[PDB]
Each structure stands twice: as structure tokens, then as C-alpha cells.
Design an enzyme around this catalytic site. Structure first.
Site, PDB file in Angstrom:
ATOM      1  N   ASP A  58      -0.394   4.971   0.789  1.00  0.00           N
ATOM      2  CA  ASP A  58      -0.737   5.914   1.850  1.00  0.00           C
ATOM      3  C   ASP A  58      -0.762   5.197   3.196  1.00  0.00           C
ATOM      4  O   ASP A  58      -1.491   4.205   3.370  1.00  0.00           O
ATOM      5  CB  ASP A  58      -2.088   6.621   1.582  1.00  0.00           C
ATOM      6  CG  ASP A  58      -2.505   7.550   2.741  1.00  0.00           C
ATOM      7  OD1 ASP A  58      -1.651   8.336   3.212  1.00  0.00           O
ATOM      8  OD2 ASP A  58      -3.669   7.470   3.202  1.00  0.00           O
ATOM      9  N   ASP A  96       0.873  -1.199   0.000  1.00  0.00           N
ATOM     10  CA  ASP A  96       0.000   0.000   0.000  1.00  0.00           C
ATOM     11  C   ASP A  96       0.901   1.237   0.000  1.00  0.00           C
ATOM     12  O   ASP A  96       2.075   1.157   0.359  1.00  0.00           O
ATOM     13  CB  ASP A  96      -0.895   0.016   1.222  1.00  0.00           C
ATOM     14  CG  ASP A  96      -1.908   1.151   1.212  1.00  0.00           C
ATOM     15  OD1 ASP A  96      -2.462   1.507   0.149  1.00  0.00           O
ATOM     16  OD2 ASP A  96      -2.182   1.638   2.324  1.00  0.00           O
TER      17      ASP A  96
HETATM   18  F1  ALF Z   1      -4.044   2.171  -1.846  1.00  0.00           F
HETATM   19 AL1  ALF Z   1      -3.711   2.961  -0.266  1.00  0.00          AL
HETATM   20  F2  ALF Z   1      -3.406   3.774   1.324  1.00  0.00           F
HETATM   21  F3  ALF Z   1      -5.079   2.072   0.509  1.00  0.00           F
HETATM   22  F4  ALF Z   1      -2.336   3.823  -1.046  1.00  0.00           F
HETATM   23 MG    MG Z   2      -3.163   3.100   3.060  1.00  0.00          MG
END
Ligand code: ALF
Ligand code: MG
Length: 218
Positions: free
Chosen positions: A10, A8
Site C-alpha cells: 500500500d 511494501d
Molecule cells: F505492508 Al504496507 F503499506 F505497510 F502494504
Molecule cells: Mg504502505
């Protein structure tokens, strides 16, 4: 040993949320809507651009046409992209760089599994592109977290099955997506948010290669 780590963006690699907040606060200032603060922004995390806009419009019980909606959405986007030109290597979360170095040193594949429409740009601004074997394109997946699609795509994109992979996530919906992909989730945050049945670290400094190995072995 696991063959890949699926990241991921973020809340794992960086605080990309902060820039979305400032773009929303700035748009709301421009159009005279009060109340877009850090606590209201808790209700925008993991929310789509359009839903986030609607919740903002709802602070003023404001009514707008489909065209006006599109145009405000566009301005926030313009704002955000302008703000992220200042992203730099210092925005990388503690321990993440070291982990990527150790993963690459052990020939463990690295893929981004983010909904961010600016993933490649953001990794390049953080100087992280050379570590990433692939970036799953969220425009090419049929369904968003908690559906496992993005994680499945990230794993495939580096030529592994999800079952050979560890996924790292800060969101409960992301944790679900990793489980349903077949890969092994390790969350960062608190068990109150993420679930009680997976390994969780309190912050990204705890994401070490040694720790990932231990968890894979256990
Ligand atoms: F795809 Al994400 F935080 F949930 F960058
Ligand atoms: Mg995230």
C-alpha cells in the site's frame, strides 16, 4: 550491487488504502454511523482492522458485545474483498511496473513485504505475480511494522540477507522496520512523515533502477 528489493504494497505498488476506506464507509452507512470520511480515514491508515472498527464505533460512542464486534469486522472484510475484485493493472502506481521489469532484467530479486492479508490476490489482479520471487506471509511473522520481521522474512524468502537489499516504504513505521532489518530504506512521501535521515522520493515515478543503483552506490 544490491541483490533484492523488498516492496511494501500500500502506497508503493498501489493505493490499497482507497479500497479499505470504501469498505469502512460502506459498513458505517449500513449501520448508520456518520463521519467516516477521507479525513477520518487518515486515522485508519496503518491501523488494524479491529482498532479501525473501534475508532468507527467511537464516532457514535457506540457500545457492542464481542460477538457484534466480530460480525461487523467480518462484514467490512466481506465488503473489502468484494471491492478488490475490480483491482486491475491500471491500479499499479506510476513507474512501478517499469522498475519491476528492470529489476527482473538485472536478476535482482523481488519480494513483497506487506501486512496485506490479500497480497497474493492483489498482485495477481495487478498482473504482477510473475515479477515476484516471493511474498512474505504476514500470518507467519510474530510482529508487525515497525518490527523488522516482515522485511527480514521477505529478504530470506528470496535467499538474501537484508543487508543485500533495498526496502521501499511510504510509512514511517515501515521505514523503521527496514532500518532495523539491515536493509537500505528508500521512502516515498515527505521527510516530515518519514524521517530526515533516509533517502526519500516524492512519488513512485522516481523509483527507477538507475536511482536505486545511485543510492546504493552512495
Ligand atoms: F505492508 Al504496507 F503499506 F505497510 F502494504
Ligand atoms: Mg504502505
Amino acid at each position: 550491487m544490491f541483490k533484492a528489493v523488498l516492496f511494501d504494497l500500500d502506497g508503493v505498488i498501489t493505493d490499497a488504502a482507497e479500497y479499505h476506506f470504501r469498505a469502512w464507509k460502506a459498513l458505517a452507512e449500513e449501520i448508520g454511523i456518520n463521519g467516516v470520511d477521507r479525513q477520518f480515514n487518515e486515522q485508519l491508515k496503518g491501523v488494524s482492522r479491529e482498532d479501525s472498527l473501534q475508532k468507527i464505533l467511537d464516532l457514535a460512542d457506540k457500545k457492542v458485545s464481542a460477538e457484534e464486534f466480530k460480525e461487523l469486522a467480518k462484514r467490512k472484510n466481506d465488503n473489502y474483498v468484494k471491492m478488490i475484485q475490480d483491482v486491475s493493472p491500471a491500479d499499479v502506481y506510476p513507474g512501478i511496473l517499469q522498475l519491476l521489469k528492470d529489476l527482473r532484467s538485472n536478476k535482482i530479486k523481488i519480494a513483497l513485504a506487506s501486512a496485506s492479508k490479500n497480497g497474493p490476490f492483489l498482485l495477481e489482479r495487478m498482473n504482477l505475480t510473475g515479477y515476484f520471487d516471493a511474498i512474505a506471509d504476514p500470518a507467519e511473522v510474530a510482529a508487525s511494522k515497525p518490527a523488522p520481521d516482515i522485511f527480514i522474512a521477505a529478504a530470506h524468502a528470496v535467499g538474501v540477507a537484508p543487508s543485500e537489499s533495498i526496502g521501499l516504504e511510504d510509512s514511517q513505521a515501515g521505514i523503521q522496520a527496514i532500518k532495523d532489518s539491515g536493509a537500505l530504506p528508500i521512502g516515498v512521501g515527505r521527510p516530515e512523515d518519514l524521517g530526515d535521515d533516509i533517502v526519500i522520493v516524492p512519488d513512485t515515478s522516481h523509483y527507477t533502477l538507475e536511482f536505486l543503483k545511485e543510492v546504493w552506490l552512495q
